[PDB]
Amino acid sequence: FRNNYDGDTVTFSPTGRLFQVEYALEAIKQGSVTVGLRSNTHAVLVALKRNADELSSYQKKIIKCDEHMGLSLAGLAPDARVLSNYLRQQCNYSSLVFNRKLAVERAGHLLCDKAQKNTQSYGGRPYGVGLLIIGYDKSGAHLLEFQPSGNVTELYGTAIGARSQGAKTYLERTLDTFIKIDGNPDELIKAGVEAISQSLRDESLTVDNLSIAIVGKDTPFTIYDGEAVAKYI
Amino acid sequence: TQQPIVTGTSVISMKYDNGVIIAADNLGSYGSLLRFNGVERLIPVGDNTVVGISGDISDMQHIERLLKDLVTENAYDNPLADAEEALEPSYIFEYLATVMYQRRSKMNPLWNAIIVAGVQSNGDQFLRYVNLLGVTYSSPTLATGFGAHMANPLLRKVVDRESDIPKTTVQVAEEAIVNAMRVLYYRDARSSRNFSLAIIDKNTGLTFKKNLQVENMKWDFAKDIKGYGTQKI
């Protein structure tokens, strides 16, 4: 069984499964937790950063792609770099060649197409990281969830990483509330923090521990880390 | 490394209080042979833009094709193709600008001079030029070929600077445009009498008129001229 059909991404199991892709998805579940949630005016990202020792830094999980887009990563960081870098290039191309801010919807479509090549090609390997993408554009705020399988989905909010299910359910209830947090950045953030706290167990989210990012109407994708997230615990 | 063959002459344009107008004749000259008499050289892109092109026709025709494709491909996986993520004049222009400068830098230019006139999503008039060398600029009035020489001086007596745009009416503007067109027929050996005019107003949208003609012509005075100096009769 499995041991015969999991050797590579160019093999389908007898059930119609792609194990290498599936195995890829697992490194995500192993990663720390991050949450995304958008109102109609802003989109926030709150992600729990994970240290290695009490003597180390907390792996940076959010990346700015353009002044209007960014994402939080969950899983294999390198693959995150490779992917955000690609997102950076496509954003650049739209600005340069069309003087148009790239549509998050399109950014999504592009990421899916990139991952998919490493899920039907020999010797290649699926990406091992999930991504939460937020952005404000010509049609308001957005939040996109990307999976190495190549699947990308736009949601009012969501969470990924270990214990993600906590926050994912939390938001699923908190919806009617946060989606109405228009014109009040700090609140959405709060909502985000609360949500993120729903997938905790270790210790309470701290200064070196938390990472939040916000994008919106008159707010360029800005990264808040440590000293500045204090007011959000 | 080319040399234009079938060509089209000036394209004139100016922007007014709530829009822009642009025009060009319907001739495809082959040197001194006025060869083709039904050549539209004003290219409507969507509902908020018209791109007028002068220069080599075969390259124009190529740019027509590039423009349709630009439209086709923007519809793709774009739910907002006929709205918020529709092609704006600036997008079309920056694309074309980009191509012109790339073809010049490869030493295989698209032998044209192009004016992109239109109005943006937020209501701003848009008028800008780019040519075979990738040179681009914008002004309340713009024209290529002879029109730069003859039309600009005329069109500018109406709109000499930015502040005059809000004080200028469609009627005023269109009047100007048709006169300039008449002038050009008198002094440009490569002009034709038949032409196309188009207005892009922030309210009426895009009006495109086909089959206009130069009228009100003053030729009667030619009868009192005989000889070239000393001749009496």
Swiss-Prot record, chain A:
The chain residues annotated with the modification Phosphoserine are S13
Compartments (UniProt record):
Cytoplasm; Nucleus
Q: Where is this cross-link: Glycyl lysine isopeptide (Lys-Gly) (interchain with G-Cter in ubiquitin)?
A: K190
> What subunit structure does UniProt give?
The 26S proteasome consists of a 20S proteasome core and two 19S regulatory subunits. The 20S proteasome core is composed of 28 subunits that are arranged in four stacked rings, resulting in a barrel-shaped structure. The two end rings are each formed by seven alpha subunits, and the two central rings are each formed by seven beta subunits. The catalytic chamber with the active sites is on the inside of the barrel.
| Main localization (coarse) | cytoplasm
- Fetch the Pfam families from UniProt: Proteasome, Proteasome_A_N
Q: Write out the function statement from the record.
A: The proteasome degrades poly-ubiquitinated proteins in the cytoplasm and in the nucleus. It is essential for the regulated turnover of proteins and for the removal of misfolded proteins. The proteasome is a multicatalytic proteinase complex that is characterized by its ability to cleave peptides with Arg, Phe, Tyr, Leu, and Glu adjacent to the leaving group at neutral or slightly basic pH. It has an ATP-dependent proteolytic activity.
Database matches in PROSITE patterns: PROTEASOME_ALPHA_1 (PS00388), PROTEASOME_ALPHA_2 (PS51475)
Organism for this UniProt entry: Saccharomyces cerevisiae (strain ATCC 204508 / S288c)
SUPFAM superfamilies (alphabetical):
N-terminal nucleophile aminohydrolases (Ntn hydrolases)
Kindly provide the name given to this protein in its UniProt entry: Proteasome subunit alpha type-6
Can you name a GO cellular component term?
proteasome complex
Q: Which UniProt key words apply to this protein? A: Cytoplasm, Isopeptide bond, Nucleus, Phosphoprotein, Proteasome, Ubl conjugation
The text of the family note is:
Belongs to the peptidase T1A family.
Read off the InterPro entries from this record: Ntn_hydrolases_N (IPR029055), Proteasome_alpha (IPR050115), Proteasome_alpha-type (IPR023332), Proteasome_asu_N (IPR000426), Proteasome_sua/b (IPR001353)
Keyword Cytoplasm attached: yes
Miscellaneous remark of the record: Present with 7210 molecules/cell in log phase SD medium.
> Which GO terms of type biological process are on file?
proteasomal ubiquitin-independent protein catabolic process; proteasome-mediated ubiquitin-dependent protein catabolic process
Curated annotation (Swiss-Prot), chain B:
**What are the alphabetically sorted keywords of the record?**
Cytoplasm, Nucleus, Proteasome
* Name of one Pfam family that matches: Proteasome
Question: Where is the protein localized?
Answer: Cytoplasm; Nucleus
Specify the domain of life of the species encoding this protein: Eukaryota
- One cellular component GO annotation, for this chain's record? nucleus
Q: Which InterPro entries match?
A: Ntn_hydrolases_N, Proteasome_beta4, Proteasome_bsu_CS, Proteasome_sua/b, Proteasome_suB-type
The alphabetized list of GO BP terms reads: proteasomal ubiquitin-independent protein catabolic process; proteasome assembly; proteasome-mediated ubiquitin-dependent protein catabolic process
Q: Does the keyword Cytoplasm apply?
A: yes
Q: Does the keyword S-adenosyl-L-methionine apply?
A: no
Family membership noted in the UniProt record: Belongs to the peptidase T1B family.
Please give the subunit comment from the record: The 26S proteasome consists of a 20S proteasome core and two 19S regulatory subunits. The 20S proteasome core is composed of 28 subunits that are arranged in four stacked rings, resulting in a barrel-shaped structure. The two end rings are each formed by seven alpha subunits, and the two central rings are each formed by seven beta subunits. The catalytic chamber with the active sites is on the inside of the barrel. Interacts with CIC1.
Question: Please, what other remarks does the record include?
Answer: Present with 16900 molecules/cell in log phase SD medium.
Report the function annotation for this chain.
Non-catalytic component of the proteasome which degrades poly-ubiquitinated proteins in the cytoplasm and in the nucleus. It is essential for the regulated turnover of proteins and for the removal of misfolded proteins. The proteasome is a multicatalytic proteinase complex that is characterized by its ability to cleave peptides with Arg, Phe, Tyr, Leu, and Glu adjacent to the leaving group at neutral or slightly basic pH. It has an ATP-dependent proteolytic activity. PRE3 and PRE4 are necessary for the peptidyl-glutamyl-peptide-hydrolyzing activity.
Q: What is this protein called?
A: Proteasome subunit beta type-7
Which organism does this sequence originate in? Saccharomyces cerevisiae (strain ATCC 204508 / S288c) (Baker's yeast)
Q: Which gene encodes it?
A: PRE4
